[PDB]
A paper describes a structure:
Composed of a diverse array of proteins, the tegument is an amorphous aggregate sandwiched between herpesviruses’ icosahedral capsid and outer envelope. While tegument proteins in general are well-differentiated to carry out highly host-specific viral functions, tegument proteins related to the capsid vertex-specific component ([name]) have in recent years been identified as key players mediating critical functions universal to all herpesviruses. Analyses show that pUL77 seals the last-packaged viral genome end through electrostatic interactions, pUL77 and pUL48 harbor a head–linker–capsid-binding motif conducive to PVAT reconfiguration, and pUL47/48 dimers form 45-nm-long filaments extending from the portal vertex.
Similar to the portal-proximal Ta triplex, penton-proximal [name]-bound Ta triplex here exhibits the same 120° counterclockwise rotation relative to non–[name]-bound Ta triplexes that has been previously documented. However, we noted an additional conformation change in the first ~160 residues of triplex protein [name] (HCMV pUL46) in penton-proximal [name]-bound Ta triplex that has not been seen in [name] of portal-proximal Ta triplex nor any other [name] position or homolog to our knowledge. Rigid-body docking both pUL47/48 dimers with penton [name] en bloc into a global portal-resolved capsid reconstruction shows that portal-proximal tegument densities above northern tropic penton vertices fit two adjacent [name] complements whereas those of southern tropic penton vertices easily fit one [name] complement. Nonetheless, prior granular analyses consistently show that the most common penton vertices are permutations with two adjacent CVSCs bound and one [name] bound, mirroring the tegumentation we observe at portal-proximal [name]-binding-registers in northern tropic and southern tropic penton vertices, respectively.
Residue numbers in the entry:
A (entry chain W): 98 to 194
B (entry chain K): 393 to 588
C (entry chain U): 4 to 306
D (entry chain H), J (entry chain L): 1 to 49
E (entry chain G): 1 to 176
F (entry chain K): 1078 to 1370
G (entry chain T): 162 to 290
H (entry chain G): 298 to 592
Write the structure that this text describes.
């Protein structure tokens, strides 16, 4: 999967993002701020994305509700039978080799 | 349809429920069955013996165990921890020069040796040989041949070896009483029914 | 004899599939047996295609198959027409080869074309329709010749030296297009072909008379031209590899005999025809019409 | 593969159904090709194009 | 037995250049197993003189005579030395007879006539017929010459044995 | 030509069939043994003298070379076994033999069971669960579903058995064989087909109706695999249930005479006399049903 | 169209399971092992229609005669051998159409093979070594 | 008309049949002599002067010793490095240890293991199997490429941002060959294949079966193990992971001797082989006695 | 299939009368086309002083053959015959046909100029239709006569070529033209002879090595016979030289590839010569014998 | 993909077309987004399904 999505992001901007991420001495989470989930795209040399930061994901008439996509290697569960209501969290954990 | 021929019923639990209906004169040919009787398309009596099977039994394919060994080796040794004791035997050739003098030196070291798989087969009784508790069943693939796993060069390898005589069949699949009855049959054939 | 053959698709056909089939009308589809009714599994080369098995096996299998022309997709039925010798038919070319008026065509397993895309015809689950290449005689002759040459050259050599020579041999350029022979392997068919070639060459060497042997040397002494220079390069390299002998002049003919020469040349021509049969395919179509878009042609069918 | 939205929008003729087994058992055991199940109210029928 | 006849003719044709004379051998269950005989790919042979020098190398020695250097980048004179070493082996024809036979009876079943000093039968589970070349450049051949036999199987594994000319030729040369 | 389209107007099965009446047996119900030298024509014994001697001791003749790929493409399967001079009892039902230990449970033969020695009915396994299916049919560390023993015949039940390499069509293809011959064992030992058959209930019913049917030529003395046309497929319920039925068999002529002497219902019961036994037919086929007509 | 009669000795077939459609050929093969030459005459039935594959299987069958042809070439240098054999195709018929029959004419009884609904499509005398 | 060579070859026949053994008397083969061989017509001379045979036997002795001299070199290197560091050796393989263990007896067992290994080592030891791939032709170029990759300078921002991927380094898991010597019942396993990887938390080595299971003979007191890496580094490891480390020098042998003894074979094109290199082979062209021959 | 041919020259009634006598002749056309000009009839297109028999044979291979049907005032009607049917054809050859003959088409070696239809430097030349044995014999006679060309100074070789020129065929005798003019041979015949000599020379060299290569795989008796034959050939060939022919083993890959490719490309040249094209089969012939009925085998 | 047979069957509006260059030149030089060219008479439009 790393090879696949590394072949996908073969652009100068993405490589710049990776270099900036690895360059400094800070831990990763200090460099990140979460905005939300996106539901639109208008393509161009500069693209425009609209992101929700409190609410459901749906189009103009609510005729379709969008999901949240997590890559399979990042997905994590710790219970055999799920509770009816589920909360979802983002985890960053550091291995000190 | 499927039907058996040549089975040996346990003598230690023998019984009859037709004593008032049939009587067989005391011969071994009556005692040890070799024949199966069937009905024809008409209600006529027809007969099958082992001699008729020769068109099947004599073909080389029954006597060639290479595909059996290939299947046995392609799937690896069992991973279950209870089954590991089957894999521990190692066999070693060494020169015969000083063997008699070296015999004391072998016992000089007080270490016990692993029990071979073929020996382990012998202590199951006739009925529980077929139960799931028989660990060795995974090796009993061919009537005429022996199979085992063993340690060679610190790896695990599969060994296939032919059973030269019928006596080498496991006791659970050919018990001692069956062999004795078969000897009685041979003696009756040779007109030694009361032996000298 | 059966002229029209019914083929039944054991798989439900969509609108796109029947569209593809009605586009494919008049293509050439090979059949293993001239039956009256067949399943769709028997259509085409897919029942036989196998990499790691080689090209020559597929060539032989295709050469034994029977050829049919496709028409009348009629709702889960297609009708195949077996052509008759000498009549005039319209043929659709599905390969990338460029046809021209007046040339003869042969049927061969598909080569590998440059753009690597290939793209599928109908695909019913795991089954796929793969058609052979209908190709003009020079290209088929070149393919067979190069396959035989590669077989003869490759034997008893290491992979290292054969790598570059084989990479060069596999590549065909024909009428401004480039093709590669996909899977050559040294096989029983190729070995018996090589044995026949070796026997024919030995008989040719034994039969050739003194004057047909010495004709090239006499020309080399008498004449000079680019063609003769090219021939003399090969002969000189052979002679120098053999010995330090300078080019010996031929002698006066010892035994002139027209009848002996005639008989000997007849035997040589027998052996040469036998050697030629190894590479010459069977002609199946002779074209005399072609669409300017090179998509179809009007052809005469030859058995 | 089927146009389920067209089935939902278009008028239909009402019939008394006669599945031998339970309808969900017939669906789960694959009595039919081209099955679709959904729960509650699914709005996708409303986006015509 | 066709392999022996062909090899004899081939060595006769090549003798002027090679100066190698043909040596016909038969192999059975005493040298290789049934599986090895069924799967055999190539047989190779090498000639070694009395000084321990292989035929295919230069008479006056090679760079290979130098000690190895333990450098991974040098390997061991890698490509050139590999080419020199491979060059010394030579390939021989062979045929396998995969079923049990009596050798003398087999030869008499073919067109050959057999007339031995003692006609003891020899029975073998299988037979491999091959011909090796023995080098005699001076038109002389020394009893100290050594000959190597190599058998190669499809996985690339090989087995080697070596023989010296005395054991091969003591009485046969004295007879001629 | 006139073409017909049919639409099924039911939400469930709207038609039923029953096998109401039988009156004939096409096969002889005999005891003649399958000739392996026919099905495997290529094989010989390594020593030629023992090959001649073995072929003479049995009734078989010289080995034969299997046809090449192009010939097999052009032609149909070889019918190596000629017809007999006369045919009184109809088509030969060739018996195929599985080697078993003499101590195999005799009660195993008294009810319908898999002759392989282990249960392999896929209706017990969850649909499309390949690992569960393989574990069910092959894992001898897992108790057999039918009898809860490991097996009743170790020489036939597990992968790589003698009977497995004999009758499983994959191993047969490996060995090289004449596919024209019908094999009554093939339905039980064909592991891959059985695994693939593990579908949902109605899918399996449709498979049973449409495809999982036998087909045997009806005009020859020996059972040859049919050409898929001009011969209608034969229903085979044993394919679905993965079991064989027990036939009336006896060990001594005394018990056969007793069965013939007794009244109706005698063939059904099974009896034992020390070392001798009778196994009764599971349905009153032989006794009444063939001869009522 | 017509029916073709072939004596028992002149008939041979290599495939033992006859295909539905059978092509027939005339084959003559020269054996040079004797001081004179013995041309064997045969009529062959096979499902193979492609000439090259039939020639290859024929070469496989008649290897001894090929070796005899080369031996004749070496033994008598002053003489030029013709070929190994020739094959000509003439006909096609179905497997069920082939029958064994007896013929009585001039009081002699002969065993014959007949192709009941033979169709004649005569090819060419093609030679093979 | 003339007579063919084959006819006179057949009619002349053979008259000899002799058994010949190899020099070490391992294998016996039979030699046939044909009375019609062209061998007869040559004017051949033959002589077996004693000094030539003596020199030939000396050369044959030299040929045999090539493996054993290398084994002895490894042994005396072990002793030399052990003397050099005064018998103090560090842990190099991951294993837990206890201070309460009596390490004197395991030292004694290590001495016994050294003696037994020197007694049993053979041509199939891990040393020969480890050096054999070095003799392959691709080896030198691969080593040059590996060195040139290993010491290249750090990428500048331009090449990170633009153009090709980063050049991949060597894989973390290596393949080693080892010799395992067990004392309690004398048993030496020569040339066993093992996979070696370096633990993340501590930079020690972990060895695993080729199937992936952990090799456990560090925990067994009665066994010592010798490892050899493709870089010709060898570790002599006694239980607990404490090891003696040095390099397998081989400059004591000429290139020719090592090379002609055990250079690897390389195949030539034959029946059944793909003309292209590296393709998946079809079935092996066996010739067998179980079946009728195809012809 | 009908083909229309039109004359844009100015025919006279004498020209029409000369043309109507060829009513059933065989006329070759460069290509199949509905309406053609009179320039494309016959072989007159291809004739030139620098090319001869070989080039015309090669061209006649790929041409399409038509029969004639009687004339309009200005236009010729041609018929393309279909395979398997039977037609009437005119005997334009120098010999008489008879029942069962197989007829080949050949370029005309000589004329008679008796009835040539000439229209301003254009004239209608038609090929010869002759039985297969005659075509074979004259083809190989021409090929042999080409090889003798290079050393015709000796008297015995002149007598040989003199005998070779004359041919008799069942009560008909005529003389074949000599392919060498002014002590020189035309380019096409020269290439044919060069190709056949090159084929022989290459075979003599390569055969031994390929015998060895194949014998390494399997050593059948056929390869033994081939080996013996090649040894005999080398021995007889080397009788005039000292020592040995000394063929080596370590051939370079490029030399081997070039030699094999040259052998095969030289083989491709001869393929027009080694085979005769047989397209007709005469069932019935008239007693006049100048015309016959034949089955078309094209 | 465009189904040209529907255009070929359905009624059409008569238009005086105006290509500045030759039609085959504008088509060959790839002026039009999608293009279909056939010669003679193509039976495709007749098999309605």
């Amino acid at each position: 999967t790393r090879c696949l999505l590394e072949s996908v992001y073969t652009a100068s901007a993405a490589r710049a993002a990776l270099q900036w991420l690895d360059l400094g001495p800070h831990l990763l989470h200090r460099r990140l701020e979460t905005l939300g989930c996106v539901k639109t795209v208008s393509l161009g040399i500069t693209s425009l994305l609209t992101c929700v930061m409190r609410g459901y994901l749906y189009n103009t008439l609510k005729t379709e509700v969008f999901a949240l996509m997590i890559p399979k290697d990042m997905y994590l569960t710790w219970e055999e039978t799920r509770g009816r209501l589920q909360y979802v969290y983002l985890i960053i954990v550091y291995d000190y080799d | 349809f499927f039907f058996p021929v040549g089975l040996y019923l346990p003598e230690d639990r023998g019984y009859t429920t037709v004593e008032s209906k049939v009587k067989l004169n005391d011969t071994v040919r009556n005692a040890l069955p070799t024949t199966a009787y069937l009905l024809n398309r008409d209600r006529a009596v027809q007969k099958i013996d082992f001699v008729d099977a020769l068109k099947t039994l004599c073909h080389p394919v029954l006597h060639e165990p290479a595909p059996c060994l290939q299947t046995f080796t392609e799937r690896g040794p069992p991973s279950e921890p209870a089954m590991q004791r089957l894999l521990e035997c190692r066999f070693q050739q060494e020169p015969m020069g000083g063997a008699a003098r070296r015999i004391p030196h072998f016992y000089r070291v007080r270490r016990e040796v692993p029990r071979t798989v073929n020996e382990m087969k012998q202590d199951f009784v006739v009925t529980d040989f077929y139960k799931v508790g028989n660990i060795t069943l995974y090796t009993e693939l061919h009537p005429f041949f022996d199979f085992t796993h063993c340690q060679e060069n610190s790896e695990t390898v599969a060994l296939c070896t032919p059973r030269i005589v019928i006596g080498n069949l496991p006791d659970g699949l050919a018990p001692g009483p069956f062999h004795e009855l078969r000897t009685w049959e041979i003696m009756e054939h040779m007109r030694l029914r009361p032996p000298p | 004899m059966e002229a029209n053959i019914f083929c039944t698709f054991d798989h439900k056909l969509s609108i796109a599939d029947v569209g593809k089939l009605t586009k494919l009308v008049a293509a050439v589809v090979p059949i293993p047996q001239r039956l009256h009714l067949i399943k769709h599994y028997q259509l085409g080369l897919h029942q036989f295609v196998d990499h790691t098995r080689g090209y020559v096996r597929l060539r032989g299998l295709l050469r034994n198959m029977t050829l049919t022309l496709m028409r009348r997709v009629e709702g889960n039925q297609i009708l195949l027409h077996v052509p008759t010798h000498g009549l005039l038919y319209t043929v659709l070319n599905t390969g990338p080869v460029t046809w021209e008026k007046g040339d003869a065509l042969c049927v061969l397993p598909p080569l590998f074309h440059g753009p690597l895309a290939r793209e599928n015809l109908l695909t019913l689950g795991q089954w796929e329709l793969v058609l052979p290449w209908i190709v003009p005689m020079p290209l088929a002759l070149e393919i067979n010749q190069r396959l035989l040459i590669m077989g003869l050259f490759s034997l008893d050599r290491s992979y290292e030296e054969v790598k570059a020579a084989v990479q060069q041999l596999q590549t065909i350029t024909f009428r401004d297009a480039t093709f590669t022979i996909p899977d050559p392997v040294i096989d029983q068919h190729l070995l018996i072909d090589m044995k026949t070639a070796c026997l024919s060459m030995s008989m040719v060497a034994n039969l050739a008379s003194e004057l047909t042997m010495t004709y090239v040397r006499k020309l080399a002494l008498e004449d000079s031209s680019m063609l003769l220079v090219k021939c003399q390069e090969l002969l000189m390299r052979l002679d120098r590899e053999r010995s330090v002998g300078e080019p010996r002049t031929p002698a006066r003919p010892q035994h002139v005999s027209p009848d002996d020469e005639i008989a000997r040349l007849s035997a040589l021509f027998v052996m040469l025809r036998q050697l030629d049969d190894l590479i010459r395919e069977q002609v199946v179509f002779t074209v005399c019409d072609v669409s300017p878009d090179n998509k179809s042609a009007t052809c005469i069918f030859k058995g | 593969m089927e146009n389920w939205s067209a089935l939902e929008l278009l008028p239909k003729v009402g019939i008394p159904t006669d599945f031998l087994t339970h309808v969900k058992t017939s669906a789960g055991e694959e009595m039919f090709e081209a099955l679709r199940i959904y729960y509650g109210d699914d709005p996708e029928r409303y986006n015509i194009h | 037995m066709e392999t022996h006849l062909y090899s004899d003719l081939a060595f006769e044709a090549r003798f002027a250049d090679d100066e190698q004379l043909p040596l016909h051998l038969v192999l059975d269950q005493e040298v290789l197993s049934n599986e090895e005989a069924e799967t055999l790919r190539y047989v190779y042979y090498r000639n070694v003189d009395s000084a321990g020098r292989s035929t295919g190398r230069a008479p006056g020695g090679d760079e290979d005579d130098a000690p190895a250097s333990d450098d991974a980048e040098d390997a061991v004179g890698g490509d050139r030395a590999f080419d020199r070493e491979r060059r010394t082996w030579q390939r021989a024809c062979f045929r396998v007879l995969p079923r049990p036979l009596e050798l003398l009876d087999y030869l008499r079943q073919s067109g050959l006539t057999v007339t031995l000093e003692k006609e003891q039968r020899v029975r073998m589970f299988y037979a491999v017929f091959t011909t090796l070349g023995l080098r005699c450049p001076d038109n002389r051949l020394s009893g100290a010459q050594t000959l190597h036999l190599r058998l190669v199987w499809p996985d690339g594994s090989y087995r080697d044995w070596e023989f010296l000319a005395r054991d091969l030729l003591r009485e046969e040369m004295e007879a001629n | 030509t006139q073409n017909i389209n049919t639409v099924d107007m039911g939400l469930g099965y709207t038609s039923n069939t029953c096998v109401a009446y039988v009156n004939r047996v096409r096969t002889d119900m005999g005891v003649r043994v399958q000739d392996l030298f026919r099905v495997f024509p290529m094989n010989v014994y390594r020593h030629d003298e023992v090959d001649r001697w073995i072929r003479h001791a049995a009734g078989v003749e010289r080995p034969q070379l299997l046809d090449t790929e192009t010939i097999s493409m052009l032609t149909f399967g070889s019918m190596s076994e000629r017809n007999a001079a006369a045919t009184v009892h109809g088509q030969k039902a060739a018996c195929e033999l599985i080697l078993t230990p003499v101590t195999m449970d005799v009660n195993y033969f008294k009810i319908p069971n898999n002759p392989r020695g282990r249960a392999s009915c896929m209706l017990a396994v969850d649909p499309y669960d390949t690992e569960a299916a393989t574990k069910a049919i092959y894992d001898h560390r897992e108790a057999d579903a039918q009898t809860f023993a490991a097996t009743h015949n170790p020489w036939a039940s597990q992968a790589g058995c003698l009977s497995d390499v004999l009758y499983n069509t994959r191993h047969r293809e490996r060995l090289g064989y004449n596919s024209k011959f019908y094999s009554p064992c093939a339905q039980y030992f064909n592991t891959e087909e059985i695994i693939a058959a593990n579908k949902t209930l109605f899918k399996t019913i449709d498979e049973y109706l449409l495809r999982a049917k036998d087909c045997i030529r009806g005009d020859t003395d020996t059972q040859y695999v049919c050409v898929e046309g001009t011969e209608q497929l034969i229903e085979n319920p044993c394919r679905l249930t993965q079991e064989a039925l027990p036939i009336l068999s006896t060990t001594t002529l005394a018990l056969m005479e007793t069965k013939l002497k007794g009244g109706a219902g005698a063939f059904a019961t099974s009896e034992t006399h020390f070392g001798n036994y009778v196994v009764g037919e599971i349905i009153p086929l032989q006794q009444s049903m063939l001869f009522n007509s | 169209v017509f029916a073709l009669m072939i004596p028992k000795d002149m008939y041979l077939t290599w495939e033992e399971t006859r295909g539905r459609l059978q092509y027939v050929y005339l084959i003559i093969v020269y054996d040079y092992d004797g001081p004179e030459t013995r041309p064997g005459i045969y009529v062959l039935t096979s499902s193979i229609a492609h000439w090259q594959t039939l020639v290859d299987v024929a070469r496989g069958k008649f290897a001894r005669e090929r070796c005899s042809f080369v031996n004749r070439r070496i033994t008598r240098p002053r003489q030029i051998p013709l070929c190994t054999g020739v094959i000509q195709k003439l006909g096609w018929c179905l497997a069920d159409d082939i029958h064994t029959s007896f013929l009585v004419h001039k009081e002699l009884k002969l065993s014959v093979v007949r192709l009941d609904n033979f169709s004649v499509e005569l090819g060419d005398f093609r030679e093979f070594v | 008309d003339e007579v063919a060579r084959t006819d006179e070859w057949k009619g002349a026949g053979v008259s000899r049949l002799r058994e010949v053994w190899d020099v070490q008397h391992r294998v016996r083969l039979r030699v046939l002599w044909y009375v019609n061989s062209f061998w007869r017509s040559r004017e051949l001379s033959y002589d077996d002067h004693e000094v030539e045979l003596y020199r030939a036997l000396d050369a044959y002795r030299a040929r045999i010793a090539v493996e054993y001299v290398l084994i002895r070199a490894v042994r005396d290197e072990i002793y030399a490095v052990l003397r050099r560091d005064g018998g103090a050796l560090p842990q190099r393989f991951a294993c837990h240890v206890s201070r309460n263990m009596s390490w004197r007896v395991v030292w004694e067992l290590c001495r016994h293991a050294l003696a037994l290994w020197m007694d049993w080592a053979d041509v199939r030891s891990c040393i020969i199997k480890a050096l054999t791939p070095r003799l392959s032709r691709g080896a030198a170029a691969a080593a040059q490429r590996a060195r040139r990759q290993r010491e290249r300078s750090a990428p500048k921002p331009q090449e990170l941002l633009f153009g090709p991927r980063n050049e991949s380094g060597p894989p973390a898991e290596q393949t080693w060959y080892a010799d395992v010597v067990r004392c309690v019942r004398a048993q030496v396993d020569l040339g066993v294949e093992v996979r070696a990887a370096r633990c993340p938390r501590t930079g020690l080595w972990i060895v695993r079966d080729r199937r992936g299971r952990l090799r456990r003979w560090l925990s067994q007191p009665e066994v010592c193990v010798l490892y050899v890496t493709p870089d010709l580094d060898f570790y002599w490891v006694l239980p607990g992971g404490f090891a003696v480390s040095s390099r397998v020098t081989l400059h004591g042998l000429a290139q020719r001797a090592l090379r002609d003894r055990f250079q690897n074979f390389e195949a030539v094109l034959a029946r059944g082989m793909h003309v292209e290199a590296g393709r998946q082979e079809p079935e092996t062209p066996r010739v067998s006695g179980r079946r009728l021959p195809f012809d």
